[PDB]
């Protein structure tokens, strides 16, 4: 059984450079290498195969080149839409047909500030018994944020979920939701709701909030 | 026009059994193997096996011998594999790849994928509840920002797809990860609506459509 390893494993660039990711086997497989590409939840697709050959519709600034040991494949000027995991796979001793660990992509640009939207609970969703309030911070870089709920200037902890997106396809960057929840009963209980959005685009934290029932 | 469809997303409980679909298309099917492989949340690719969907021939890899089986039905140009005794470290994504060539066998087409989940909860269609915002200073030259809210849905393969009241599509469809919460997920969908139009339209609302495994879904989202 022969083992592809993938070299770096994370990789950053921005816009408009040369990547090269490195493919290495613990034994000669001659030019019996394809490379696949993966984006967030989708399935692989076959850039390269036998090496040095390009599928056609691929884009031409992708190239493979290698043979024996060491493999390369190469993205010539890299581009938003490139954000994804690489993979290379082996077809010289089958089976088992063994891939790489994969080589994750991640696309450096400069800072962007997060636009905050507060969200209060529907009056159906308040019928349920339950109360969820919802922040949502879009397009922003890097990746680092905080998002801090307040009830009646009360710091909440333990009550939200957040959840933040993989870079954009386009803009390369990231979009975060944080969730708020409470029973109806105590959604009911207090008056004034906010998220505050800490990220370095921000020249200081801003703070979003709504009145219950004031909506 | 080569495409490979595969079934949809499933929770079974621990020592259960699953079969998963590849129907495929724009091709002899017959003529080009079928491989499994296998993607566990966060980790890479696994390969599981082939079948000849031609002899019907099969050959598994050594982790699966005993537990996998691989089928064909030629008439209905579908595949099939089916995985018993199921483990949490079974719960990913599996499609089917075809594979060309006879020297340097590349899998050129792949499948959509097929989420498994292997856990002791039950499976449930999402319910949808809008999200309108309320802001202490609107501005009228600013986007206006809309959502939907999917709750109590198991598999976590939810899709959400928005159209506008004249029933055209929308194609501002921000996505974010689901989130894992009493054995069942919840996810949010957003939609900015730019003011030239909000403010020279008259429609009321936006419809927040979902598809689930168990279920599809759909709900109004208010304009404000
Ligand atoms: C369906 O509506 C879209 C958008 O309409 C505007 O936005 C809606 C949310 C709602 O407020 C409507 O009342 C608004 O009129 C139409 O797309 C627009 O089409 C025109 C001309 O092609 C173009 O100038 C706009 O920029 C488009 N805007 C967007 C966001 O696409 C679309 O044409 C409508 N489809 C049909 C069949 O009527």
């Known amino acids: 059984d022969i083992q592809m390893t993938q070299s770096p494993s994370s990789l950053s660039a921005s816009v408009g450079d040369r990547v090269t990711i490195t493919c290495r086997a613990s034994?000669?497989?001659?030019?019996?290498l394809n490379w696949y590409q993966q984006k967030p939840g989708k399935a692989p697709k076959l850039l390269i195969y036998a090496a040095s050959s390009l599928q056609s519709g691929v884009p031409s600034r992708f190239s493979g080149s290698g043979s024996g040991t060491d493999f390369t494949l190469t993205i010539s000027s890299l581009q938003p839409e490139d954000f994804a995991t690489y993979y290379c796979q082996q077809s010289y001793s089958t089976p088992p047909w063994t891939f790489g660990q994969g080589t994750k992509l991640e696309i450096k640009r400069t800072v962007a500030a997060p636009s905050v939207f507060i969200f209060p609970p529907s009056d159906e969703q308040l019928k349920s018994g339950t109360a969820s309030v919802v922040c949502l911070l879009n397009n922003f870089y890097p990746r680092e944020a905080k998002v801090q709920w307040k009830v009646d200037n009360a710091l909440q902890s333990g009550n939200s979920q957040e959840s933040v997106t993989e870079q954009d396809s386009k803009d390369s960057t990231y979009s975060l939701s944080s969730t708020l929840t409470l029973s109806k009963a105590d959604y009911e209980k207090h008056k004034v709701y906010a998220c505050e959005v800490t990220h370095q685009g921000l020249s200081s934290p801003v703070t979003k909030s709504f009145n219950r029932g004031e909506c | 026009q080569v495409q490979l469809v595969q079934s949809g997303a499933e929770v079974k409980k621990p020592g259960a059994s699953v079969k998963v679909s590849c129907k495929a298309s724009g091709y002899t099917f017959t003529g080009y193997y079928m491989h499994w492989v296998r993607q566990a949340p966060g980790q890479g690719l696994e390969w599981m096996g082939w079948i000849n969907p031609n002899s019907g021939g099969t050959n598994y890899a050594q982790k699966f011998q005993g537990r996998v089986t691989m089928t064909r039905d030629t008439s209905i140009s579908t595949a099939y594999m089916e995985l018993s005794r199921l483990r949490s470290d079974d719960t990913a994504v599996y499609y089917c790849?075809?594979?060309?060539?006879?020297?340097?066998?590349?899998?050129?087409?792949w499948g959509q994928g097929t989420l498994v989940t292997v856990s002791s909860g039950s499976a449930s269609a999402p319910t949808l509840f809008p999200l309108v915002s309320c802001e202490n200073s609107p501005s009228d030259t600013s986007s206006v920002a809309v959502g939907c809210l999917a709750q109590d849905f198991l598999p976590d393969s939810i899709t959400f797809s928005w159209k506008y009241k004249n029933n055209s599509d929308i194609s501002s469809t921000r996505g974010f990860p689901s989130v894992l919460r009493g054995g069942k997920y919840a996810a949010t969908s957003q939609v900015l609506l730019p003011s030239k139009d909000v403010m020279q339209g008259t429609d009321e609302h936006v419809v927040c459509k979902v598809q689930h495994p168990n279920g599809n879904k759909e709900k109004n989202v208010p304009l404000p």
């Open positions: 790849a075809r594979a060309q060539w006879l020297v340097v066998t590349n899998f050129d087409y």
């Open positions: 034994q000669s497989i001659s030019s019996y």
